[PDB]
Amino acid sequence: INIDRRRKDIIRTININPTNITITSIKKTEIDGAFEETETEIKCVVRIFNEKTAEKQISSEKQGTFSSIRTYGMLVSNDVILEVNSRDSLEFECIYGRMKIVNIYPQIVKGELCGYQCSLERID
Amino acid sequence: INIDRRRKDIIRTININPTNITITSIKKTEIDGAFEETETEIKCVVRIFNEKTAEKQISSEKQGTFSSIRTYGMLVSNDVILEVNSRDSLEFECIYGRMKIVNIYPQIVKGELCGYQCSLERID
Amino acid sequence: EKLRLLLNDKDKKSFTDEELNLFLEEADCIYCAASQGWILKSLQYENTVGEMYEYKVGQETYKSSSIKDLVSVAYQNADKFKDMCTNKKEKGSFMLGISTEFE
Amino acid sequence: EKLRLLLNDKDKKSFTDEELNLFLEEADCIYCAASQGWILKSLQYENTVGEMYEYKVGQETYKSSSIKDLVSVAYQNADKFKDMCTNKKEKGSFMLGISTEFE
Amino acid sequence: EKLRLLLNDKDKKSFTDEELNLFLEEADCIYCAASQGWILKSLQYENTVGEMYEYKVGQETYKSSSIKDLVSVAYQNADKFKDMCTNKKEKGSFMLGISTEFE
Amino acid sequence: EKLRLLLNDKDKKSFTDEELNLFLEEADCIYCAASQGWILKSLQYENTVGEMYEYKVGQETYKSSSIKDLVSVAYQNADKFKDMCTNKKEKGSFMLGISTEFE
Amino acid sequence: EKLRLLLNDKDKKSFTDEELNLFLEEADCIYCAASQGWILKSLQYENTVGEMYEYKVGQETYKSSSIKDLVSVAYQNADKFKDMCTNKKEKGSFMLGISTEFE
Amino acid sequence: EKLRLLLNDKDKKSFTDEELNLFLEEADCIYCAASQGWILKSLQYENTVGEMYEYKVGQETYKSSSIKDLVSVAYQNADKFKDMCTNKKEKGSFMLGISTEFE
Amino acid sequence: EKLRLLLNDKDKKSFTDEELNLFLEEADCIYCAASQGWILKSLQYENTVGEMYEYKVGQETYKSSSIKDLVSVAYQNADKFKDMCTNKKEKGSFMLGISTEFE
Amino acid sequence: EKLRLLLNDKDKKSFTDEELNLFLEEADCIYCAASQGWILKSLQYENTVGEMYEYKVGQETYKSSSIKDLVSVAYQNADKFKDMCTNKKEKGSFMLGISTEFE
C-alpha cells in the first residue's frame, strides 16, 4: 500500500463526520520519587465511532461513584503526535460524558506514521 | 507446500511494511540454585501487525504501575533463531512503548524452519 | 430563462454559470447542452466514488453504488436528452414531385 | 384540473406549480407532459436518495434501493406514459383512392 | 480559453499545460484532443489508484473501485468524446450530378 | 522529444530509456512503439500479482486485482494505441481512372 | 544484442543463454522465438507456482493466482507475439498480369 | 539433443528416459512426442489431486486447483504442441498444371 | 512390451493382466485398447472414491474431486486415446480413375 | 466368459446372478446388457442418496454428490455402452449395382 492512499483515506473518513475537540494531556514526570504533572491542551478534528458492543460498568464505593463504557473508538489524522501511557493520559470534554483515550493504535505504513486508530471510555 | 514458496511469502510480507528492530535477549542460566543473566542483542527486519482486538490491562500496586496490551502480533524471517521460555525473554524499543515477545510460533515446513510467527505485549 | 431551464434540466449547484452559458452557445437546442453537461457531470465520479464506494469503520458500515452504476445513470441521462433533441428535430417521411425540362 | 391530474400522475410535492404549467404548455397531451415530468423527476434521485444506498450504524442496518433501480423505474414510467400518449394519438392503417386529371 | 475548457473536460489538474497545448495542436477540434487526453489519463490510474483496490486494517476497511472499472470508465469517456467530435464533423448523405463533354 | 512523448504514453520509471530508443528506432510511428512497450509492461505482472494478489496478516487483509484484470487493462492500452496508429495511417476509399493504349 | 532483446521480450532468468540461442536459431524473426519461449515458459509454472494456489497458516493467508490463470496469460503473450510477427511479415493483396505465349 | 529437447518440452524428469525414448520412436517429430507425453503426464493427476484438492487441518487451510483445471492445462499444452507440429508440417495452397495425351 | 505400454497409457495396479491382454486382443491398435481400458477404469471410481466427496471430522476437513469430475476426466482421456487411434489409422482424401470395358 | 465379462463391465457385487443372466438372454451383445444393467443400477440411487446426500452430526460434517450427479454418471455409462455397441454394429456406406431384366 502506498502511504498517500492511507493518508487520503484517513483524511476523507475523518471529514465524512468530523468533530472538533480539545484533548488535554496531563503528563506525569518523576521528581524525587513522586510525580510532577504538566497539563497541556491540543485541538484536533476527529471522527468518533462505535467499535464494540459492551455494557456500562459502574464502580461505586466510598471514594465516589462513576460509570464508564468502553465502546467508542476514535480515528485521528497525523497532524498531532499522541502518546498515552501508564503515566500519561489524554481526555476531552465531549458532551454526553467525558471521553478518555485508553489506547492508541498508530497507523504506520513503511515506518512513516499517517494517523492513529484509537479507543475511548465515555466516563459518565 | 514447498519450502521456497513459504520463504518467498514470508520475505515478501516482511518487505511490504518492514521495521528495523533491535531485539535484546536476556537469558537466565541456573547457577548454584539461582539465576545468572547474560544479556545479548540481535537485529532483525520485522513486520508488526494487529492479531487480536484485546483490551489494555493496567496493574497498579506498591511495586509500580504498568499497563500492557496483547494486540500486536509480529512476523520475522528465518535469518535468526529465536527462543522464549520462562527463563528467557526478547524485547525491543518501539517508540510507542516497549514490545515484548510473549510467544514464538515457528513456521516449519517438512521439518525445515522458514520463519517465526510471533505475538507481543506492548508494555506502556 | 434558458439558463434557468438548463440548470433545472440537470443538477443545479455543481457548476458555475459561465460554463453553462458556454454550453448554451455551443449548441442551439438546450437539450444538447443538457446532454453535454450531463456527460461533464459524469466525469466527476472518478474522485467521489472511484476512490472509495464502500467503507467500514468500527461497527459502522457504509455502501454506495459503484462508479459503473453512477456513470451508467449519468450516460443514460445524457443519451436520453440526446434522443429528446433528435426527436424534437425529427420529421417524418415525405413524397415529393420531380420537374425536369423538355421541349 | 389539468395540473391536479399531472400532479397525481407525476407524484406530488417534487416540483412547484409553474414548471408543471410549463410542462403542460410544452405538449398539449397531458401524458406526454407527464412523461417529460417523470424523466426530469428521475434526476431528483441524485439528491433525495444519494449514491449511498445501504449503511449500518450501531444496531440499525438500512438497505434502500440503489439510485440505478429508482432511475430505471422512473424511465419505465416515462416510457409507459409516452406509449400511452402515442396510443391516444394512434390511428390504424388506411387505403385511399388515388386519382388524377386527364383528357 | 480552450485550455480551460479542456481542463474542465478532464477534471483539471492531472496534466500540465504543455501537454494540453500539445493535445490541442494534435487535432483542431477540442473534443478529439479531449478524447486523446482521456485515453492518456486512463494510464495514470495505475499510480493514482494502484492494483490494491480493497484493504482492511484495524477497524477500517476501504473498498475502492478496481483499476479495470476506472479505465473502463475512462475509455467510455474517450469514446463518447470521439463520437461527439464525429457528430460535429460528419454530414449527411448526398446525391450529385455528372457531366462529360461529347461531340 | 519523442522519447519524452513515449515515456508519457507509458509510465515513466519502469524501463531504461535505451531500450525505449530501441523501440523507437524499431518502428516509425511512436504509437506502435508505445503499444509494444505496453505489452512488454504487461509481461511484468507474473512476478508482482501472479505470486500473490490478495493476502491477510492478522487483522490486516489486503486485496488487489487479479493478474487477469491487470493483463486485460495492459492489453487494452496496447490495442487502443495500435488502433490509434492504424487510424492515423489509414485513408478512405477512392475512385480512380483506368486508361490503356489503343490505336 | 538479440539475446538481450529476447530476454526482455520474454521475462528473464527462467531459461539459460544457450537455450535462447537455440530459440533464435529455430526462427529468424525474434518474435516467433519469443512466442515459443513464452509457451515453454508457461510450462515452468507447474514448479514455480504449484497447484496450491491458496493457503492459510497460523495468521497468514496468501492467495496466489492459480496455474490456469498464469498459463492463460502466458498463452496470451505467445499469441500476441505471433500476431506481431505475422503483422511484421505479411503483405497486402494486389493484382498481377498474365502473359501466355502465342503465335 | 532430441532426448534433451523432449525432457525440456515435457517438464523435466517425471518419467524414465527410456519410455521417453519410446515416445521418440513412436513419432519422428519431437513435438508429437511431447504432446503424447503431456497427455500421459495428465493421466497422473488423478492420484495427486482427484482424491484431495483442498483440505484443512486445525487452523491451517490448504487449497489447490481442481483436477479439472489441471487436466485442462495439461491437455491445452498437448494440443498446443499438436498444433505446432501440424503447422510445421503444413504447406500452403498452390496451382499446378495438367498434361493429357492426344494425337 | 505392449502390456507395459498399456499400464503406462493408463495408471497401474488397478487391472490384472488378463483384462489387459483381453483388451489388446480386442483391438490391434493399442490406443483403442487403452481407450477401452480407460472407460472401464472410469467405473472403478464408484469404489475408489465413493459418492462422499467432502467430509469434516473433529478439526480435519478433506475435500475431494466429485465422482462426476473424475469420470468426466476418464471419458476425456478415453476420447483422446480414441482420437489418437483414428489419427493413426486415418488417411486423407484422394482421386481415382474409373475404366469400363467397351467395344 | 460372458457372465464374468459383464460383472467386470458393470461394477461388481450389486445384482444377483439370476438378474445378470436375465440380461444376457435379453440381448445378444453383452454391451447392450451392460447398458441396461447400468440403467437398472442407476435406479437404486433413490434410496441411497435421495433421502440424504449431505448431513452434519455434531461437529462432524459429511457431504456427497447429489442424486442428479450420480444418476447423470450412471446414465452416461449406460449411454456410452449403448453407443459403443452400436458402433461395433455400425458399418460404412456402400455402392451397389442394379440388374433389371429385359429381352
**Residue B26: in which H helix or E strand, if any?**
strand B19-31
Cross-chain Cβ contact D67/C65 below 8 Å = yes
Q: How far is E65 from chain F (nearest CA, A)?
A: 10
Task: Tell me the residue type at I101.
Answer: E
Resolution (A): 3.3
Return the exposure string of I71-99: e unless at least 16 CB atoms fall within 10 Å of the residue's CB, then b.
bbbbbbbbebbbebbeeeeeeeeeeeeee
Q: What experiment produced this structure?
A: cryo-EM
Task: Tell me the residue type at J65.
Answer: S
Residues in chain B closer than 8 A to F52 (CB atoms): 9, 12
Rounded-to-integer distance, Cα I41 and Cα I33, Å: 12
* Chain E contact for A73 (CB, 8 A cutoff): yes
- The answer to whether G11 and G70 have CB atoms below 8 angstroms apart is no
Q: How far is F22 from chain G (nearest CA, A)?
A: 9
- The answer to whether I60 and H56 have CB atoms below 8 angstroms apart is yes
Residue B13: closest C-alpha in chain G: G60
User: Phi/psi at G62 (nearest 5 deg)?
Assistant: -125, 130
Strands (E), E24-66: 54-57, 60-63
Rounded-to-integer distance, Cα H81 and Cα H84, Å: 5
User: Phi/psi at E63 (nearest 5 deg)?
Assistant: -120, 95
Q: How many CB atoms lie within 10 A of CB A55?
A: 8
Residues in chain C closer than 8 A to A73 (CB atoms): 57-58
Q: Indicate the residue of A8, A53, A75 with minimum beta-carbon distance to C57.
A: A75
Break chain G down into helix, strand, coil percent, rounded to 5: 55, 10, 35
Residues in chain H closer than 8 A to I73 (CB atoms): 45-46, 50, 67-68, 71
Give the best residue of J5, J48, J63 to mutate against chain I (max I CB count within 10 A): J63
Inter-CA distances, A60 with A91, D30, J100, Å: 22, 73, 123
Look up residue G62 and give its three cell numbers: 496468501
Per DSSP, the three-state class of A68 is strand
Name chain C's partners: 3 or more CB pairs within 8 A.
A, D, E
- The answer to whether E74 and C66 have CB atoms below 8 angstroms apart is no
Query: How is chain J classified by DSSP, letter by letter?
Result: -HHHHHHHHS-SSSS-HHHHHHHHHH-SSHHHHHHHHHHHHHTTHIIIIIS-SEEEETTEEEE---HHHHHHHHHHHHHHHHHHHHHHH--------------
Cross-chain Cβ contact H58/I61 below 8 Å = no
Residues in chain E closer than 8 A to A73 (CB atoms): 59
As a dihedral over the C-alpha atoms of residue A70, residue A76, residue A81, residue A82, rounded to 10 degrees, the angle is 0
List CB contacts of C92: < 8 A, sequence separation 6 or more.
none
Q: What is the number of residues in chain C? A: 103
- The answer to whether H7 and H13 have CB atoms below 8 angstroms apart is yes
Ramachandran assignment for I57, one of left (phi > 0), alpha (psi -120 to 50 degrees), beta (any other): beta
Cross-chain Cβ contact I19/J8 below 8 Å = yes
Q: What is the DSSP letter of A80?
A: S
* Chain F contact for B110 (CB, 8 A cutoff): no
D touches I (3+ CB pairs < 8 Å)? no
Return the exposure string of C2-29: e unless at least 16 CB atoms fall within 10 Å of the residue's CB, then b.
eeeebbbbbbeeebeeeebebbbeeeee
Residues in chain G closer than 8 A to B10 (CB atoms): 60
Strands (E), E42-98: 54-57, 60-63
Give the best residue of C43, C52, C61, C86 to mutate against chain E (max E CB count within 10 A): C43
* Chain F contact for B105 (CB, 8 A cutoff): no
Point out residues after which chain F has a gap (C–N over 2.5 Å): none
A touches C (3+ CB pairs < 8 Å)? yes
Rounded-to-integer distance, Cα B14 and Cα B74, Å: 10
